Amino acid sequence: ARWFPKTLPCDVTLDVSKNHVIVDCTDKHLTEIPGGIPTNTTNLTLTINHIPDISPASFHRLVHLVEIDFRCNCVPMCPRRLQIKPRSFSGLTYLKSLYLDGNQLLEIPQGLPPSLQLLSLEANNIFSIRKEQLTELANIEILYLGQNCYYRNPCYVSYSIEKDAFLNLTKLKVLSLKDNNVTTVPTVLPSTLTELYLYNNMIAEIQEDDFNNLNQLQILDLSGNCPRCYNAPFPCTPCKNNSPLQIPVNAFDALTELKVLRLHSNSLQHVPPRWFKNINNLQELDLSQNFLAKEIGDAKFLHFLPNLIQLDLSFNFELQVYRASMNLSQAFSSLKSLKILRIRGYVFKELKSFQLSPLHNLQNLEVLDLGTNFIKIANLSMFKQFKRLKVIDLSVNKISPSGDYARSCRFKNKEASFTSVQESCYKYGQTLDLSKNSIFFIKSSDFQHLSFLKCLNLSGNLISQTLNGSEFQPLAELRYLDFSNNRLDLLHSTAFEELRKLEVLDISSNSHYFQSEGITHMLNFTKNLKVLQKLMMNDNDISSSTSRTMESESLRTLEFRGNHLDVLWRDGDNRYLQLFKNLLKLEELDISKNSLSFLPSGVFDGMPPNLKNLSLAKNGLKSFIWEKLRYLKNLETLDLSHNQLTTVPERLSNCSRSLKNLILKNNQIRSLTKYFLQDAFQLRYLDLSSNKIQMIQKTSFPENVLNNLKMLLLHHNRFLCTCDAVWFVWWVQHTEVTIPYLATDVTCVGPGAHKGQSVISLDLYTC
Amino acid sequence: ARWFPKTLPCDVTLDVSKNHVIVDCTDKHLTEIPGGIPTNTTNLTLTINHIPDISPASFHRLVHLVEIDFRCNCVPMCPRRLQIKPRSFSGLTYLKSLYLDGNQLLEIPQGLPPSLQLLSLEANNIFSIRKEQLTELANIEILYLGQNCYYRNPCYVSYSIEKDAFLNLTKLKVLSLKDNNVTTVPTVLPSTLTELYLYNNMIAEIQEDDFNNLNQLQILDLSGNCPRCYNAPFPCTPCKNNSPLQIPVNAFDALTELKVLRLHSNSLQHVPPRWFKNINNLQELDLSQNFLAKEIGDAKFLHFLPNLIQLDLSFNFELQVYRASMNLSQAFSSLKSLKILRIRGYVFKELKSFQLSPLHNLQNLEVLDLGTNFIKIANLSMFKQFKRLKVIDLSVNKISPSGDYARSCRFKNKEASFTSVQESCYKYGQTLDLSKNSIFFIKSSDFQHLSFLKCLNLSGNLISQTLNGSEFQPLAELRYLDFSNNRLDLLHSTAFEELRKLEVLDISSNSHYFQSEGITHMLNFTKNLKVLQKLMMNDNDISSSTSRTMESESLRTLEFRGNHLDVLWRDGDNRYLQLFKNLLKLEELDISKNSLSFLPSGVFDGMPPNLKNLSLAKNGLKSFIWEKLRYLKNLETLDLSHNQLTTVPERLSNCSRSLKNLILKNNQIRSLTKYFLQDAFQLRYLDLSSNKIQMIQKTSFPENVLNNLKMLLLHHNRFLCTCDAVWFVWWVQHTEVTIPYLATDVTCVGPGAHKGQSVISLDLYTC
């Protein structure tokens, strides 16, 4: 509630349906908590700042607070550790969540309210755990005590937990003890635990009664214990004699609701089937970064996982061993519900069709990861049986053509699963990611029996070929093709002619052949592509073009950034003025970073009629004309950021009748016209931040136009706060226009003592 | 003769034994020829400048000139073409050589003296050749008329040569017609020709009487005629139907003294043995960039080349064809005198031992080039039979470990053979250049049967390994090892321990594992290397080191540039002060680009006692102490160029008693001490160029010290030419100290009209 604030430099978000008020003071360099904080707020954000300590009077009048964040308030360049006065949190009866990460605390704070449900104490100096200060946390549910003693934040003392310290926490559900130098599992954990995170510790042995009472556990993590330290870019200590993490056969017996089990980087050598005897509902299993190269050939334990969804076996290669072929056990056919399989780091020479026979009967298999394996010989025709597969990974391996602040400072989710990189080519269907491979020329015979491929990635292969319309012949149903970081010779206009169903084409980073001058550059090759929608050819350094115009009856998006359009539009050269005129359906243009010092008169007349998104960022426009914008009758998102413009148009209404997203970020504008926004009711977005503007007059910024503006930025510039802008001073602190960084970035240059003064916090009584 | 010049801005070199005086005015921006040119000079250099034309009075008083250079005086940003007045060269009776390249001349200049022997007319607009203006050149010997009409300098007209134009040039020996758009060989060439250069032309057919009278010819070039235009980064026009260069069988019949024959890039398909029937003394043969992939398997023509020395067969791959193996004909055994063989661009999958059987009996074979072939499988043990070989090339191909201005503006030599890149590893003996390969880990078994290798290059392989002293076991006689552009983990001090005879070790560009902090960095691994002489570990970004000191009893050169020595020598950290103290035999140090803002007191005490070459360039030394140089009793080549120093030492004699090569290039020094060079008789080299110095006093630059100075640089700085430096003005134009760029780079800032005035050309009479 309270809606209208007074001088708070933090953003305020209101949710009437959820009855939640959010105050975000992230990255504000506040030495102390500002005054005037509303009593109706619920979430308080107090991240990285210069707060010396916490006083009980800080939250004296705040009783509706349910979330307090204090993450990374002092990262070890920082003063002494934060001190918490006694009874500093007892007044918050409605508190439910509290974050105290990165505060260099020595002991667990006391006096916490009994209504607390979440507590985070990561990146602290708490290496001792006793029941006395845990008695007050009898109603807690989620506890985060990780990252207290490890290589980044050392304490030189092993973690000490007294007996039955967590036993009385009946409401505990999630416990995290990662990177805490823990040696022994803290028995006895409460029976209501669901997620246990003991990874990245120094645990060497597991007792048979360690998880005897945990029956509702769902997520168990035991990574980093006795890890594989070979070629490790971080300080890790192998266990002795290379010994593996000793886990008894009858260890996971009481676990019946377990769903996620992570054993990554444990130096394991054998996986007994007795482990998975009781856990029948296991879904995700991680066994990466181990020494299970021989176990994969046997994989006897896979017979007890009928409901497995994810299986990770990455980076299990043997030292000084180069396998001739991948040895997949026949027990892999028992994974009926398997969906994702990763066999990276299993470096081997040749991949054959019969080696993937166990995976032929997996109906639910979607993702098959095989990258980073240095596969030399691989017949691509063997993938014709994997039509149901969604993503096939053929990454940095060497397949060739066939011959004849800290972590806790952000990410409030804390313990979260590894989110897979969702590439733009996955949504189009079947994907064959052949990027960064040893393919140097394309043959139509290699891609045979692959008519079902809806996507193909060939970035980084460094292919030097002159396509003429016969290489991608079998790829009849291909819709997305990536050809970035290659050497494409556009000597013929029939390139990509046989790709009848192609929609998105990427030929970026092909600067090699485009940099040469005098050779033919057929830029009209898009005419044959009937259903092409997006074309990305940026960072190509295109300086000359044999074709006068580019023709495409369906192209909608064209990226032409990082090229040389100044030479194409050189003074006295009108050949390439109407280069984009024939693109009838084009709606978005990205001609940026083209070293365009000036725009010759006539380019706007040659622009496509349906242009809607024009960008000219980082171009260095010394003088950009404005009267020529009348030709574009559909422009709505003109962008001129990071340019060297110096004059705004006399009347924006006379220039464009549909512009609504004007952007002039990081420009050099000292003053605006006296009728800059006169009768321009169609505008909704305006940006003038990072400029050299001095003052704004009333006649240039009418309130009628400003009422409908969704966003307006005037921060990080050189405004002068004298008695000549009393109207601006009154309006900036009395309007509802969303102006971000109104009290943190925009300051006053002068005069004199007014250096660094907040404009919204200005009151010139003598004016 | 004449020894002492007056105001010439060109360097003068005297050779009394050869009676030759050399005047070099290269890159001087002289609008007109300067006055006071000596009449005794012999070689005149008048390269790229702003000379409008040539007048007969330019060489009126010069009669001893024997060489005039006018290369690239107007490169097409340039005014109208250079005009030569009639009878502008008839007064030079002793002229023998004349260069007129890059002058945009339309016709051959007339009035040349009959004593001329060399004439260069490259990069001109002369596309017509007639006997009338060639009559005056009856005594010429070397003619250069190439680069007159091609893609860089087009003329849109085919070259026209009248019948028997060169017939009467009886003294002609070398003729060049490269890149001249020539269609037909200009019959009839004189019988005294020795070198003919008709390459890079549009010749489509060769007549049987084309070389009927050439019996003394030695070098013949026919490249570029009907070239292989596939993947060509330059504008080339394939001949029709791909047709090859039609050469009759009885074409090279009259040639008996021919030694070099170049047929590179001719689209040849078959090489009949009839061509080499008469030429028995052929030494170098070039057949690269052709379609002779099938001919290599036959190679029937190789039986007629018993004295062949060089054979080039690079880039003869077939389009859309990936050969399974290299097919070398058995006729290669007939090349008894073969020394260099290049089989690049013959892309094939696997290389076997039996495929190199024809080369097993070549006793004189030294270089075997096989790079850029994409070889996948290659057993390195098959090279044990090639012990007599000097260089073995295993370049960018994908071998993996075994499994289980213009051109004429410079280069006065003009037509010169392609000089092979002499790498630093060739002088040490047998070389196995395995750079840029697909090797990702090193095994001792792979390098078996290779004990004869004296050099090994492994740069760019990107190997991530933690060597412990067992990988390079069979390489007992290795003396040079290159490990640049890799990922070396120095977790053990026993690395490279088994390389008992290693002398030079290069571990540069290994920044990956050295950038990480907290892991062990054993920098004392050089202790085991008993005979190590040079160690290059630059560009490694070394910021921490587990070892306190580096020990080596034989190391002499150490390159430590592009690292992080500021953190190692951080204030309050004296652990790594004596890092190089134990290097007793060290004599050269290259600690540069280390971001050293300042040198902590004590590093000079920890320097090796035998240090002789210290470099601190591009370090940013804000304040470099000088009194500590007394510790180094053997310093002679101190370098502080490209630094941010601001004060010179009070007395250089008190600082160092042996410094003789002080360098302070690109520094920021405004003034020198009044006793900078007092009693410093041991100095021989001094550099203060590119500084902000204002004036030099007499008491700081005594003539006694300046007499023995070999070189002294004071150019490109901010000297002030007022009446306060009359002694400097008198001395700079009255001393014999070698000061380069005395009249071209060093100018006067002021005062007023004295902007840009030459210091050596100053005469203040009013002073």
Ligand SMILES: *[C@@H]1O[C@H](CO)[C@@H](O[C@@H]2O[C@H](CO)[C@@H](O[C@@H]3O[C@H](CO[C@H]4O[C@H](CO)[C@@H](O)[C@H](O)[C@@H]4O)[C@@H](O)[C@H](O)[C@@H]3O)[C@H](O)[C@H]2NC(C)=O)[C@H](O)[C@H]1NC(C)=O
């Ligand atoms: C202001 O503070 C409030 C508390 O003081 C915040 O309310 C919290 O909002 C989160 C959601 O953002 C709730 O989390 C719930 O989690 C359960 C369990 O899901 C678990 O598993 C999923 C994966 O399947 C995982 O993503 C979750 O993080 C959990 O680990 C869900 O079923 C719920 O739908 C919900 O996501 C908290 O319970 C809730 N706290 C309280 C006390 O209600 C609020 O988000 C804050 N607002 C801002 C803007 O920061």
Ligand SMILES: *[C@@H]1O[C@H](CO)[C@@H](O[C@@H]2O[C@H](CO)[C@@H](O[C@@H]3O[C@H](CO[C@H]4O[C@H](CO)[C@@H](O)[C@H](O)[C@@H]4O)[C@@H](O)[C@H](O)[C@@H]3O)[C@H](O)[C@H]2NC(C)=O)[C@H](O)[C@H]1NC(C)=O
């Ligand atoms: C000043 O001008 C003088 C002429 O006006 C220059 O004298 C010339 O010097 C060059 C050497 O630099 C002489 O070239 C001779 O070439 C023959 C033939 O060798 C040929 O083959 C070799 C490869 O084996 C090749 O490198 C050569 O270039 C030749 O193609 C050699 O046998 C000789 O030793 C010598 O190298 C000229 O003959 C000579 N000209 C005259 C008229 O004597 C002088 O070099 C100029 N000085 C400067 C500093 O520019």
Ligand SMILES: *[C@@H]1O[C@H](CO)[C@@H](O[C@@H]2O[C@H](CO)[C@@H](O[C@@H]3O[C@H](CO)[C@@H](O)[C@H](O)[C@@H]3O)[C@H](O)[C@H]2NC(C)=O)[C@H](O)[C@H]1NC(C)=O
């Ligand atoms: C995680 O906990 C273990 C507990 O053992 C820590 O190991 C201990 O580390 C300290 C600090 O390096 C060692 O103290 C050392 O003692 C030697 C004398 O023996 C002294 O010369 C050193 O200067 C140092 O004070 C201690 O010995 C060692 N414990 C054992 C059993 O070896 C480890 O450091 C902790 N990890 C982190 C990141 O804090």
Ligand SMILES: *[C@@H]1O[C@H](CO)[C@@H](O[C@@H]2O[C@H](CO)[C@@H](O[C@@H]3O[C@H](CO)[C@@H](O)[C@H](O)[C@@H]3O)[C@H](O)[C@H]2NC(C)=O)[C@H](O)[C@H]1NC(C)=O
């Ligand atoms: C085809 O495969 C290539 C290589 O596998 C993909 O290129 C890679 O794409 C990812 C995601 O866009 C890039 O990651 C990003 O890197 C930047 C730094 O450049 C970082 O700031 C981002 O946060 C993100 O991590 C990755 O750099 C890029 N690799 C290269 C060499 O460009 C490409 O996206 C694939 N194409 C399709 C259509 O899937």
Ligand SMILES: *[C@@H]1O[C@H](CO)[C@@H](O[C@@H]2O[C@H](CO)[C@@H](O[C@@H]3O[C@H](CO)[C@@H](O)[C@H](O)[C@@H]3O)[C@H](O)[C@H]2NC(C)=O)[C@H](O)[C@H]1NC(C)=O
């Ligand atoms: C090397 O010599 C050949 C000699 O044939 C040159 O080919 C000629 O090039 C000119 C200029 O491009 C061509 O003239 C053209 O004529 C057409 C009408 O046919 C006109 O529309 C063009 O605007 C142009 O004026 C000429 O036809 C052509 N000769 C032949 C037989 O095709 C070639 O240009 C020369 N190369 C260089 C680098 O100068």
Ligand SMILES: *[C@@H]1O[C@H](CO)[C@@H](O[C@@H]2O[C@H](CO)[C@@H](O[C@@H]3O[C@H](CO)[C@@H](O)[C@H](O)[C@@H]3O)[C@H](O)[C@H]2NC(C)=O)[C@H](O)[C@H]1NC(C)=O
């Ligand atoms: C081992 O093999 C590698 C690669 O074959 C050699 O590196 C290459 O060395 C050459 C000659 O020093 C470099 O050429 C130079 O390039 C610079 C530009 O970087 C240019 O300014 C010079 O004029 C010259 O052309 C080449 O760049 C370099 N390649 C790489 C990737 O670094 C290496 O020298 C070999 N080592 C030994 C001991 O022979």
Ligand SMILES: *[C@@H]1O[C@H](CO)[C@@H](O[C@@H]2O[C@H](CO)[C@@H](O)[C@H](O)[C@H]2NC(C)=O)[C@H](O)[C@H]1NC(C)=O
């Ligand atoms: C694939 O892995 C399996 C399991 O490790 C291998 O089968 C074992 O092979 C060894 C060596 O011959 C025998 O001693 C074992 O008795 C075999 N066990 C079983 C269950 O068969 C198999 O040889 C591997 N195949 C390849 C090609 O490496």
Ligand SMILES: *[C@@H]1O[C@H](CO)[C@@H](O[C@@H]2O[C@H](CO)[C@@H](O)[C@H](O)[C@H]2NC(C)=O)[C@H](O)[C@H]1NC(C)=O
């Ligand atoms: C990759 O596998 C496919 C199919 O298994 C091979 O295609 C065969 O090609 C030959 C010659 O073109 C035909 O005679 C066969 O009938 C094809 N097989 C089938 C099942 O139709 C292809 O040759 C393999 N690639 C390589 C390099 O061996």
Ligand SMILES: *[C@@H]1O[C@H](CO)[C@@H](O[C@@H]2O[C@H](CO)[C@@H](O)[C@H](O)[C@H]2NC(C)=O)[C@H](O)[C@H]1NC(C)=O
């Ligand atoms: C596209 O390029 C391919 C590759 O050169 C052409 O295929 C060749 O065509 C020629 C002329 O008909 C034949 O002599 C070759 O035998 C063909 N090679 C192969 C491997 O088939 C193809 O004709 C070109 N297509 C177009 C339309 O230019």
Ligand SMILES: *[C@@H]1O[C@H](CO)[C@@H](O[C@@H]2O[C@H](CO)[C@@H](O)[C@H](O)[C@H]2NC(C)=O)[C@H](O)[C@H]1NC(C)=O
């Ligand atoms: C793309 O434009 C080029 C010209 O820039 C077109 O090439 C011309 O094609 C016609 C028709 O065969 C020829 O008569 C001309 O001689 C060609 N000119 C050049 C310079 O090659 C090409 O056809 C166009 N392609 C498309 C698909 O429109």
Ligand SMILES: *[C@@H]1O[C@H](CO)[C@@H](O[C@@H]2O[C@H](CO)[C@@H](O)[C@H](O)[C@H]2NC(C)=O)[C@H](O)[C@H]1NC(C)=O
């Ligand atoms: C290596 O090259 C030789 C010469 O081209 C090949 O020998 C020819 O092979 C063809 C095809 O079998 C025959 O028609 C010719 O009669 C052969 N000529 C001679 C002189 O033998 C040979 O087959 C090639 N070998 C390989 C492995 O490619």
Ligand SMILES: *[C@@H]1O[C@H](CO)[C@@H](O[C@@H]2O[C@H](CO)[C@@H](O)[C@H](O)[C@H]2NC(C)=O)[C@H](O)[C@H]1NC(C)=O
């Ligand atoms: C590369 O060639 C060498 C020699 O030709 C092979 O060395 C053989 O190795 C086996 C097993 O170690 C021995 O039984 C043989 O006696 C060796 N040959 C000789 C001549 O001594 C080596 O195996 C080959 N590499 C590969 C990958 O096959």
Ligand SMILES: *[C@@H]1O[C@H](CO)[C@@H](O[C@@H]2O[C@H](CO)[C@@H](O)[C@H](O)[C@H]2NC(C)=O)[C@H](O)[C@H]1NC(C)=O
């Ligand atoms: C290089 O220096 C390291 C120390 O920085 C040496 O390692 C020590 O070796 C001794 C002898 O075995 C051990 O007692 C120490 O515990 C080691 N210290 C560490 C930190 O590992 C190493 O031996 C030196 N190597 C050489 C060749 O002198």
Ligand SMILES: *[C@@H]1O[C@H](CO)[C@@H](O)[C@H](O)[C@H]1NC(C)=O
């Ligand atoms: C124009 O591009 C911007 C880029 O952020 C996008 O937000 C906007 O929706 C686009 N407008 C149209 C009409 O596509």
Ligand SMILES: *[C@@H]1O[C@H](CO)[C@@H](O)[C@H](O)[C@H]1NC(C)=O
């Ligand atoms: C500017 O706008 C006014 C008012 O609509 C109009 O009268 C005038 O013609 C316009 N001028 C230009 C150059 O568009």
Ligand SMILES: *[C@@H]1O[C@H](CO)[C@@H](O)[C@H](O)[C@H]1NC(C)=O
């Ligand atoms: C010191 O290094 C320079 C680098 O050019 C070299 O010229 C000089 O000979 C070296 N001096 C000694 C004594 O090696």
